[PDB]
Amino acid sequence: MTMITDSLAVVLQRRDWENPGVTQLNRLAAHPPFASWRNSEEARTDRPSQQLRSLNGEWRFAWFPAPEAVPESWLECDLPEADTVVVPSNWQMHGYDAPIYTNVTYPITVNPPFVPTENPTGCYSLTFNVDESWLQEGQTRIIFDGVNSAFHLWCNGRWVGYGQDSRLPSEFDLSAFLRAGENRLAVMVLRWSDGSYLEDQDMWRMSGIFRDVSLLHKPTTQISDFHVATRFNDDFSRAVLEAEVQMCGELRDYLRVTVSLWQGETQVASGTAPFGGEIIDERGGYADRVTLRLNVENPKLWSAEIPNLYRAVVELHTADGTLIEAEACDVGFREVRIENGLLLLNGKPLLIRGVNRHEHHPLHGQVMDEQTMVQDILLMKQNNFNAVRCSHYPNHPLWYTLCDRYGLYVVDEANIETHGMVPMNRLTDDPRWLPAMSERVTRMVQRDRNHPSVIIWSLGNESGHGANHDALYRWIKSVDPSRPVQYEGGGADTTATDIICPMYARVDEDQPFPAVPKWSIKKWLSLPGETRPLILCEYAHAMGNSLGGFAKYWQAFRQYPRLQGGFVWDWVDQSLIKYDENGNPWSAYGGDFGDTPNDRQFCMNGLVFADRTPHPALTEAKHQQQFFQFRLSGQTIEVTSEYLFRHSDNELLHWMVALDGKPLASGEVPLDVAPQGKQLIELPELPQPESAGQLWLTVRVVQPNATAWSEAGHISAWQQWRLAENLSVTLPAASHAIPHLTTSEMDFCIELGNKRWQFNRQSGFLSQMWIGDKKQLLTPLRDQFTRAPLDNDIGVSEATRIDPNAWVERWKAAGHYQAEAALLQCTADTLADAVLITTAHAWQHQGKTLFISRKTYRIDGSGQMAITVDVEVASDTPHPARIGLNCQLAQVAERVNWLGLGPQENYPDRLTAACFDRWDLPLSDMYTPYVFPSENGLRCGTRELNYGPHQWRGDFQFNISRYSQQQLMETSHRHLLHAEEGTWLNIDGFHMGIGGDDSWSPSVSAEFQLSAGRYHYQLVWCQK
Amino acid sequence: MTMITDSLAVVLQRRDWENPGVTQLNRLAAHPPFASWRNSEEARTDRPSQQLRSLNGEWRFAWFPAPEAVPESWLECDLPEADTVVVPSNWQMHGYDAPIYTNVTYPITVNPPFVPTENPTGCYSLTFNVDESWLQEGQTRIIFDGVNSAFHLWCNGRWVGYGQDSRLPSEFDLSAFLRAGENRLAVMVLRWSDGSYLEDQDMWRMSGIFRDVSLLHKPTTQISDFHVATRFNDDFSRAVLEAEVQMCGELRDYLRVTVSLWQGETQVASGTAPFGGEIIDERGGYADRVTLRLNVENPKLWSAEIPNLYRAVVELHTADGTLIEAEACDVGFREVRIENGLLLLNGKPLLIRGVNRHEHHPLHGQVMDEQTMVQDILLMKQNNFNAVRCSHYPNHPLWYTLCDRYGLYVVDEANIETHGMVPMNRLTDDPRWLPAMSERVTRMVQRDRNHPSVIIWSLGNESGHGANHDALYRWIKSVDPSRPVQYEGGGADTTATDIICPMYARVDEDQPFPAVPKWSIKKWLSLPGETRPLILCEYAHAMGNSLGGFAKYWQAFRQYPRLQGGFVWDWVDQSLIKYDENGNPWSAYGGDFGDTPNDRQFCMNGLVFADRTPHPALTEAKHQQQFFQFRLSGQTIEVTSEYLFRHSDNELLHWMVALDGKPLASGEVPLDVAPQGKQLIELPELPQPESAGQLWLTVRVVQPNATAWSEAGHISAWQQWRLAENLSVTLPAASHAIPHLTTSEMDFCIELGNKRWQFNRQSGFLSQMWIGDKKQLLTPLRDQFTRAPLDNDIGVSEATRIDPNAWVERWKAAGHYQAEAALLQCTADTLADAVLITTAHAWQHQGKTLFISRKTYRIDGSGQMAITVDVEVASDTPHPARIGLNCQLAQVAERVNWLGLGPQENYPDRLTAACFDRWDLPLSDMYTPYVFPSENGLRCGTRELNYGPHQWRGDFQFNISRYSQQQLMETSHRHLLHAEEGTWLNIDGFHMGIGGDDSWSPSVSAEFQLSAGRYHYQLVWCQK
């Protein structure tokens, strides 16, 4: 045995972390979560095992710059300078280092298997007392659920072992190291290791002991492994539960295994045997294994709709009935099978409403606690998601337990991503890395094998396509034939996948990339020879103000049989909290910790914010993924259930009819629909539209009773329609007053009653308005063509590396943000009962006319200003972002009241969730606090807008706020915005879609581009 | 860096050899045999590269009992007690240890991954001078082609690395260790390692550095890899040679690769490019790889019939034309493809005439030199073999080169056999061993990828069927799609094989073993769902006096399309030379070195002896596997060629007609047959049988001209037929003399002329005969029913563990070897011209009559004794081994002359090669020196036997020798036999077949069992 003074010397001299063939030393075999009960009643009822002891809490910690900087004294006793830290935790989150956010590019110099000499090293220590009885007999092991990236373990000064792979649990046998009473652990964690080359996920790269650490005591003769398989008869009315139990230790003739299956408090099934399997081959079978087969009549099948679980208890006991130890596991009777071309669950065709989820927490980095796991799940269920993809690594054990119990389908990904390699499969087609890769895959499978929520195995992410994938694909298929295996790398449809699984493939647009073309999903299905199902690995890139065109996917998913859904990218913004000089917290993105190079805002692509409040866009997802489809025909509403297994036994349809925001009628019909069935609900003879206006019919599926994951009264689905409409043929009332027009050389001054309008005759714009004597404007009413670029407008274009195709580049190149208004025409005429101002402007840039805008203002005798705007866009100029007006109002008012699509932010290509009604929000809620300031808060389909003492009527989109578009464009972080004096108001006649198929290549569909050349809109601006 | 005094301490403290996850440390990547030429003309013409330096020769060696016994001083300087040994060599072959021969059972205690503490350790050392220029620039590496089993390498006292896997080449970079001038290697070789668990082949387990060791100098910028693939157009009239070259080092813009293809001295094709492959995936392609495509018009296709090779030369050079380095490789244009259900080669259906071959040499253990490799090949070709299975491990590199050049198909097996595990797949279905296994497979493939002789990849042998096989199967299919993958473990037809490949499956007999039933090969093909080809991994177990029923296989192979041959088990007896007290050498088998437990004679299953002389049985193989089939109809001989590619352009048919051994006619016809075609050869009106007797027609295909592997006049095929027969209706000539019969109470004394016969009236047997006055017998003429048990009679039955089913057990149990002759009847009568003796005996055992034998002797007046024998066998008694007579002749004569099937040893179920003729052999050649003494030398179908002054006529089988059956049965080794006085002669009327489907379960087909109950034969014994 080495001595402390040469233990660090020798151990570090070997340099295991730069040797990809050595992934672990003395680590134990992977297996299911064991708890080691000495009482099968406690096993059954899931009671905190006394043999499982958490070591979480206060550890000592020292930070070094490189392994070699550590002092040998550290193995003997705690360093005087060690700080007290809480385990689990990333040490970047305590300011010992900088968390690094790159996307593709490796944080380190790429030279596999070598890592930077300077290699931030974390020295963890724990002093703890061990119970003598644990040491008297049995085996005590230590479990590390997650240490990033590699580490060495000493116990009482003696080197125990070496671990690697940040996302899987490492176990070491400490029975030969522990002594009675005071013991000491010393864990040396390295930030970079050869394993880092296979862990190139798009996330904050942090390090340390970041999942739970514990001790487990198991008796000498012990259950070492335990598999549950389930077979069904044709119609799932009978199941066979096959339990494979493997023991290790002193195999004896009186050992017996009893496997017991419980439904709550009912022992549904039970089987007992002695060890000794059947003959496997020429030399016999496994003496140390036993297979039990339980028959279950009418198994309650597990689904995400109805998560029916059983409790399996495995008793290892003597023939005399003395329990040696018990383990237990939740069992879900469900069958996953790809057949013909469809992924089936219990015989039904799945439709995946999924989302990619990262293990991220703004304060605790990548330490995930139960509390927030539950929160995430509830939010997902409440927004009509039924699946989660573990992007891109084995998740914290508890997660799977929760998904089993709540009802989510899980895609479980192996911790392998070599995205930054050139070419991507440089390692994954290299034999020498196959050992490293295999361990990552195989340990994952062994660990999570028994969960019912896990539906699909994934081979990892973005690692090209190499022979190692083919091998590992086959390995999984061999070992766990009950699930399907998925892998997108290589181009979504290689031979290492059961499912065509692509990332950001567009619905109707082919993207024929060299080598790995990315077809439209509709095309892809039909390509000569393709018989597999297609599920989108990643689609809809939710980078801030996004999900434009989301509806197209769901249209397609519903229409095509082999389009079986996909996973939205992604759940939650990966932002981190930083503090300002006043101690206020703010959301940081790539680069904000001094990490360079980095990929800036690309860490934030969530449907919810890091604090789990939701982005507007999440409601679009909820709508599109709802489980009830509605079709209106006359008085009949056809309700179609998209549930596969559950009957609608907690739903009722509430319906309302309204006339331009006024409630005329309503009712409420118990909704009773069989899985995949229909109900026809005929409405009472609906009110006859009293006057002018549009009738709207709104229906909502409400859930009377609270559920495991929802409040009573939860709205799960909705839909709205236009009904009868009456055009207003009513003539405007005549007024005994004609606005008086005074003309100077500076302005046109129109006066009616106490209202004055001043048109700045040198600019051509309405410059000021008075009510009584109060000036209404701070900034003149002018034409607006630009948008404070969204993430989808910017894409991957950068100041130091421009991408010409990005919309913002096109606009900047075209001078959209620089064009100046040349006053062309300017006249003011008195009509028989009005004043008519007519102007024309040429918006020009470098001698080229980009826009021509012709406007007329009609001030009538009732004090209403009718504005008519005609715009001509140069056909050769990138389509303008918007076509509207804006100004800055002097008035700041409290509430914004309006008639249109709402209440939340909605865009031309993200409207379908929004409902037409009379909405009313405090001004603050008009602004959507995106971490990376950009255009936000547009509300579409607005017929009337009320703010302060101003009313706008017509048909427009509007955006009311405290920040100018300019300020939004300039500002880099949300927390740096300054509410400007007055109120900024944008009123768009037309507005370009926001896109969102991906945030690196222009994804705004043609019909949402302002390409019509000639535009026209009208707006009535009166007081109120 | 560790110091010598703690280098052994530290290195051995880690204990890599008991840790299955650590297979190597600092070993370089596998690749094709490189030679590093600095002149592409030398590359082209295969000239000994000056950059490749052998280190073979005199090394220093010390033997320890365990790693820890080695003294640290050994790393500094040579131990005073180190002996000089020649590398390569197994140290068991120099008496430092005992070679161990077990078959299934592991030589060590089974406790994966742990190996016996006492672990015989070989300490090798080499002092050598290094040329300064090698050290000035470039990379010097050391190559170990085979070190058994694991080893540590130090260079100049500094630990270089760790190697494992006895059959694949290990390379280490020594450029950082070597110094100018005197350097020292220190290699510590361990007999047992964790790798031993995967190396459980049926062979002598020996150890040490047993293949070549050398140094290789490659320039800094170097070719690191190099693949050749070949594609063909539909009819093989155009090929595309795809060369993939990979470099490593300073990739520069002026690097160019030229690949040149030569046909002898003609540059057939050539292509040049710069490094930089095409885009592979989203991040580009391989900057350091280049693919060249050469078009070849009318490629000369490579086959075993016509081994057409090209020479590919790969020049790495600058753009200016400066050669950096060259590598080269022989290329064989051939395509291997399984289609419909058949394994095709260049479009033709293969028929595998193969044999399993071990790398074995009676004096040098497992060190295989070129000389004997060539010898083996020539023998194989000359006995009509066309394929070799590398049983069961990557062979010595040169072997493949030779097979390329001579023309043999090779099955290349990965070095994996876990046969002794329980169950067999205990390791191969265990994730944790998948790294170990994968390296074995992948390194093999990388190494031998480019050979044309290699046709099939094999995943190893007898290791059950586990997930690791499935994975590795897929890996190979992915990486080398041009070949098929074979694996028999699991039951010949799992999903990890392209070919149904079984061991010792019988032709027409199913062997329904629990779990892994072994069907008849005819049945197997047809089993619902089986579409693959079937090739017998191992069949026909040639354990000594065997190959009974061999003809049945070849009958079947020719008849069924999907039976495509197989590999005979096996080529050469694995025996070792030991010495007696006089310094004479003798062949040793398991147990003879004190190795216990062991599997005795099961190491010897060759077609040839260890000294490469041939067992009789080899000629049976040659006959059955000949490439010409003959069918006789009247005067027409139909000759069918079984060549697939070559036309018969060096053959002529010699034919002879003979009458009972007398030549009547002959002729010789140029044999001109197109591949798979026919020629009809009509014979001249054949001689009319002059007198009584049987006409025989013999044809032989002789090869006029010498070939690369045969002498001029080589006989390649033959066949014989019976033609017209004349029955002898000639009456025996009357003689004027009647044997005088004198009767006493002791005997019947018959006297005629100078001949006397004495029948011992108390025994019933002819006891003595005189000619003149010379006694002719030593032992009386008695009935014989037993056989000196063959290996197929004994099987796996042992003195300390009996297997009741073995024929020898049945016979012993029945008392066949103990039955005593009770004289029942005894009379002597005088006939009108003869004396008639009639006797009857009851052969009884424990009160039960086993045989009744009734014999008559008719002494006629010409001095001829006609013997008639009638035998009754008890139906409930295991069928007697033989039914005949035997005696011991006083006369020892020099030559044995006889008319019958010969010349070599032939048995009832191994006759087809033997030809009917007049043969004449010195008595010595009647005895077949099988290492394990047993019944041998039978000659069947004998009509006349001449020995000394005795002539036997009739129709019988006979066995004439110097050893009694008893002595043969008792003696354990060939060298312990003692020629007895006189000559032992057995004359069988009937004889049981020898069997040979396997040597562990009774494999004598029913029609070769003596089961008819009543037997009868006649024999004429006269002087001459």
PDB file of C-alpha atoms in Angstrom, chain B residues 157-288:
ATOM      1  CA  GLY B 157      14.351   1.344 -15.901  1.00  0.00           C
ATOM      2  CA  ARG B 158      11.292   3.411 -16.769  1.00  0.00           C
ATOM      3  CA  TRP B 159       7.917   1.784 -16.906  1.00  0.00           C
ATOM      4  CA  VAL B 160       6.607   2.027 -20.402  1.00  0.00           C
ATOM      5  CA  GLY B 161       3.312   0.256 -20.377  1.00  0.00           C
ATOM      6  CA  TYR B 162       1.113  -2.766 -19.865  1.00  0.00           C
ATOM      7  CA  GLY B 163      -0.123  -5.293 -22.372  1.00  0.00           C
ATOM      8  CA  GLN B 164      -2.678  -8.078 -22.519  1.00  0.00           C
ATOM      9  CA  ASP B 165      -4.227 -10.635 -24.975  1.00  0.00           C
ATOM     10  CA  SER B 166      -1.822 -13.300 -26.042  1.00  0.00           C
ATOM     11  CA  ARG B 167      -2.648 -13.402 -29.720  1.00  0.00           C
ATOM     12  CA  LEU B 168      -2.567  -9.845 -30.891  1.00  0.00           C
ATOM     13  CA  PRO B 169       0.372  -7.513 -31.445  1.00  0.00           C
ATOM     14  CA  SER B 170       1.127  -4.933 -28.800  1.00  0.00           C
ATOM     15  CA  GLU B 171       2.891  -1.744 -29.673  1.00  0.00           C
ATOM     16  CA  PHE B 172       4.501   0.820 -27.451  1.00  0.00           C
ATOM     17  CA  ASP B 173       6.132   4.090 -28.294  1.00  0.00           C
ATOM     18  CA  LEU B 174       9.692   4.021 -27.004  1.00  0.00           C
ATOM     19  CA  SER B 175      10.878   7.298 -28.466  1.00  0.00           C
ATOM     20  CA  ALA B 176      10.778   8.967 -25.057  1.00  0.00           C
ATOM     21  CA  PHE B 177      12.675   6.123 -23.401  1.00  0.00           C
ATOM     22  CA  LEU B 178      15.482   5.142 -25.704  1.00  0.00           C
ATOM     23  CA  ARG B 179      18.906   6.719 -25.485  1.00  0.00           C
ATOM     24  CA  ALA B 180      21.759   6.625 -27.943  1.00  0.00           C
ATOM     25  CA  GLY B 181      23.700   3.408 -27.721  1.00  0.00           C
ATOM     26  CA  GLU B 182      23.059   0.801 -25.061  1.00  0.00           C
ATOM     27  CA  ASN B 183      19.441   0.349 -24.021  1.00  0.00           C
ATOM     28  CA  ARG B 184      17.738  -2.266 -21.908  1.00  0.00           C
ATOM     29  CA  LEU B 185      14.290  -3.823 -22.069  1.00  0.00           C
ATOM     30  CA  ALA B 186      12.718  -5.483 -19.118  1.00  0.00           C
ATOM     31  CA  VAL B 187       9.585  -7.476 -19.717  1.00  0.00           C
ATOM     32  CA  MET B 188       7.641  -9.111 -16.962  1.00  0.00           C
ATOM     33  CA  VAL B 189       5.350 -11.794 -18.263  1.00  0.00           C
ATOM     34  CA  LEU B 190       2.586 -13.285 -16.190  1.00  0.00           C
ATOM     35  CA  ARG B 191       1.185 -16.726 -16.794  1.00  0.00           C
ATOM     36  CA  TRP B 192      -2.233 -15.966 -15.377  1.00  0.00           C
ATOM     37  CA  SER B 193      -4.235 -12.821 -15.841  1.00  0.00           C
ATOM     38  CA  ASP B 194      -7.870 -11.819 -15.889  1.00  0.00           C
ATOM     39  CA  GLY B 195      -7.579 -12.181 -19.666  1.00  0.00           C
ATOM     40  CA  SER B 196      -7.009 -15.892 -19.074  1.00  0.00           C
ATOM     41  CA  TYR B 197     -10.696 -16.162 -18.343  1.00  0.00           C
ATOM     42  CA  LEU B 198     -11.372 -15.284 -21.961  1.00  0.00           C
ATOM     43  CA  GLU B 199      -8.655 -17.561 -23.305  1.00  0.00           C
ATOM     44  CA  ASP B 200      -9.892 -21.015 -22.499  1.00  0.00           C
ATOM     45  CA  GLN B 201      -9.083 -22.806 -25.744  1.00  0.00           C
ATOM     46  CA  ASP B 202      -8.609 -26.550 -25.940  1.00  0.00           C
ATOM     47  CA  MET B 203      -4.825 -26.508 -26.101  1.00  0.00           C
ATOM     48  CA  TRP B 204      -1.622 -26.746 -24.146  1.00  0.00           C
ATOM     49  CA  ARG B 205      -1.576 -23.739 -21.946  1.00  0.00           C
ATOM     50  CA  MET B 206       1.907 -22.333 -22.121  1.00  0.00           C
ATOM     51  CA  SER B 207       3.301 -18.879 -21.689  1.00  0.00           C
ATOM     52  CA  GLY B 208       6.045 -16.404 -22.437  1.00  0.00           C
ATOM     53  CA  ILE B 209       7.064 -14.286 -25.372  1.00  0.00           C
ATOM     54  CA  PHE B 210       6.134 -16.608 -28.144  1.00  0.00           C
ATOM     55  CA  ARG B 211       5.867 -14.482 -31.207  1.00  0.00           C
ATOM     56  CA  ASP B 212       8.295 -12.050 -32.792  1.00  0.00           C
ATOM     57  CA  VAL B 213       9.571  -8.855 -31.197  1.00  0.00           C
ATOM     58  CA  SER B 214      10.815  -5.891 -33.195  1.00  0.00           C
ATOM     59  CA  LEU B 215      11.410  -2.158 -33.462  1.00  0.00           C
ATOM     60  CA  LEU B 216       9.840   0.068 -36.033  1.00  0.00           C
ATOM     61  CA  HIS B 217      10.921   3.527 -37.034  1.00  0.00           C
ATOM     62  CA  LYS B 218       8.348   5.757 -38.654  1.00  0.00           C
ATOM     63  CA  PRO B 219       8.823   9.404 -39.624  1.00  0.00           C
ATOM     64  CA  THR B 220       6.993  12.066 -37.625  1.00  0.00           C
ATOM     65  CA  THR B 221       4.334  12.573 -40.249  1.00  0.00           C
ATOM     66  CA  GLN B 222       3.186   9.074 -40.928  1.00  0.00           C
ATOM     67  CA  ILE B 223       0.574   6.794 -42.363  1.00  0.00           C
ATOM     68  CA  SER B 224      -1.378   5.597 -39.374  1.00  0.00           C
ATOM     69  CA  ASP B 225      -3.976   3.492 -41.111  1.00  0.00           C
ATOM     70  CA  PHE B 226      -4.812   2.159 -44.514  1.00  0.00           C
ATOM     71  CA  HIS B 227      -7.859   0.243 -45.730  1.00  0.00           C
ATOM     72  CA  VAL B 228      -8.524  -1.390 -49.057  1.00  0.00           C
ATOM     73  CA  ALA B 229     -12.054  -2.076 -50.205  1.00  0.00           C
ATOM     74  CA  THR B 230     -13.196  -3.479 -53.509  1.00  0.00           C
ATOM     75  CA  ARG B 231     -16.427  -2.963 -55.382  1.00  0.00           C
ATOM     76  CA  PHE B 232     -17.492  -4.707 -58.532  1.00  0.00           C
ATOM     77  CA  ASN B 233     -19.837  -4.200 -61.375  1.00  0.00           C
ATOM     78  CA  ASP B 234     -22.445  -6.855 -62.012  1.00  0.00           C
ATOM     79  CA  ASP B 235     -20.265  -9.409 -63.720  1.00  0.00           C
ATOM     80  CA  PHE B 236     -16.929  -8.619 -62.120  1.00  0.00           C
ATOM     81  CA  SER B 237     -15.565  -7.027 -65.276  1.00  0.00           C
ATOM     82  CA  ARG B 238     -14.841  -3.775 -63.536  1.00  0.00           C
ATOM     83  CA  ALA B 239     -13.724  -3.012 -60.062  1.00  0.00           C
ATOM     84  CA  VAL B 240     -13.304   0.005 -57.914  1.00  0.00           C
ATOM     85  CA  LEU B 241     -10.499  -0.109 -55.453  1.00  0.00           C
ATOM     86  CA  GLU B 242     -11.259   2.197 -52.592  1.00  0.00           C
ATOM     87  CA  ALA B 243      -8.233   3.081 -50.568  1.00  0.00           C
ATOM     88  CA  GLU B 244      -8.711   4.878 -47.319  1.00  0.00           C
ATOM     89  CA  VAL B 245      -5.554   6.349 -45.963  1.00  0.00           C
ATOM     90  CA  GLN B 246      -5.225   7.987 -42.610  1.00  0.00           C
ATOM     91  CA  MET B 247      -2.224   9.955 -41.469  1.00  0.00           C
ATOM     92  CA  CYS B 248      -1.158  11.339 -38.157  1.00  0.00           C
ATOM     93  CA  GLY B 249       1.300  14.056 -37.262  1.00  0.00           C
ATOM     94  CA  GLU B 250       1.775  17.529 -38.682  1.00  0.00           C
ATOM     95  CA  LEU B 251      -0.913  17.730 -41.316  1.00  0.00           C
ATOM     96  CA  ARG B 252       0.348  20.064 -44.021  1.00  0.00           C
ATOM     97  CA  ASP B 253      -0.960  21.562 -47.212  1.00  0.00           C
ATOM     98  CA  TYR B 254       1.695  19.938 -49.337  1.00  0.00           C
ATOM     99  CA  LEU B 255       1.027  16.407 -48.202  1.00  0.00           C
ATOM    100  CA  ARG B 256      -0.054  14.066 -50.931  1.00  0.00           C
ATOM    101  CA  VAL B 257      -0.977  10.438 -51.097  1.00  0.00           C
ATOM    102  CA  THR B 258      -0.408   8.287 -54.078  1.00  0.00           C
ATOM    103  CA  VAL B 259      -1.852   4.845 -54.251  1.00  0.00           C
ATOM    104  CA  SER B 260      -0.475   2.654 -56.930  1.00  0.00           C
ATOM    105  CA  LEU B 261      -1.716  -0.738 -58.011  1.00  0.00           C
ATOM    106  CA  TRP B 262       0.635  -3.190 -59.633  1.00  0.00           C
ATOM    107  CA  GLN B 263       0.220  -6.441 -61.437  1.00  0.00           C
ATOM    108  CA  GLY B 264       3.681  -7.819 -61.101  1.00  0.00           C
ATOM    109  CA  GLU B 265       5.710  -5.235 -62.975  1.00  0.00           C
ATOM    110  CA  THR B 266       2.782  -3.417 -64.544  1.00  0.00           C
ATOM    111  CA  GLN B 267       1.343  -0.378 -62.915  1.00  0.00           C
ATOM    112  CA  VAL B 268      -2.288  -1.219 -63.367  1.00  0.00           C
ATOM    113  CA  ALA B 269      -3.771   1.792 -61.669  1.00  0.00           C
ATOM    114  CA  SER B 270      -2.832   4.926 -59.814  1.00  0.00           C
ATOM    115  CA  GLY B 271      -4.431   7.794 -57.957  1.00  0.00           C
ATOM    116  CA  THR B 272      -3.127  10.855 -56.150  1.00  0.00           C
ATOM    117  CA  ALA B 273      -4.784  13.265 -53.781  1.00  0.00           C
ATOM    118  CA  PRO B 274      -4.278  15.681 -50.918  1.00  0.00           C
ATOM    119  CA  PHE B 275      -5.541  15.008 -47.459  1.00  0.00           C
ATOM    120  CA  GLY B 276      -9.050  16.096 -46.706  1.00  0.00           C
ATOM    121  CA  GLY B 277     -12.042  13.825 -47.069  1.00  0.00           C
ATOM    122  CA  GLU B 278     -15.564  14.844 -48.008  1.00  0.00           C
ATOM    123  CA  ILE B 279     -18.094  16.143 -45.554  1.00  0.00           C
ATOM    124  CA  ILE B 280     -19.186  13.363 -43.258  1.00  0.00           C
ATOM    125  CA  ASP B 281     -21.542  15.246 -41.005  1.00  0.00           C
ATOM    126  CA  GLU B 282     -22.588  18.686 -39.791  1.00  0.00           C
ATOM    127  CA  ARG B 283     -19.061  19.592 -38.754  1.00  0.00           C
ATOM    128  CA  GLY B 284     -17.207  18.550 -41.876  1.00  0.00           C
ATOM    129  CA  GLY B 285     -15.029  15.569 -42.673  1.00  0.00           C
ATOM    130  CA  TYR B 286     -11.663  14.089 -41.847  1.00  0.00           C
ATOM    131  CA  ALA B 287      -8.891  16.515 -42.598  1.00  0.00           C
ATOM    132  CA  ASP B 288      -6.406  13.738 -41.895  1.00  0.00           C
TER     133      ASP B 288
END
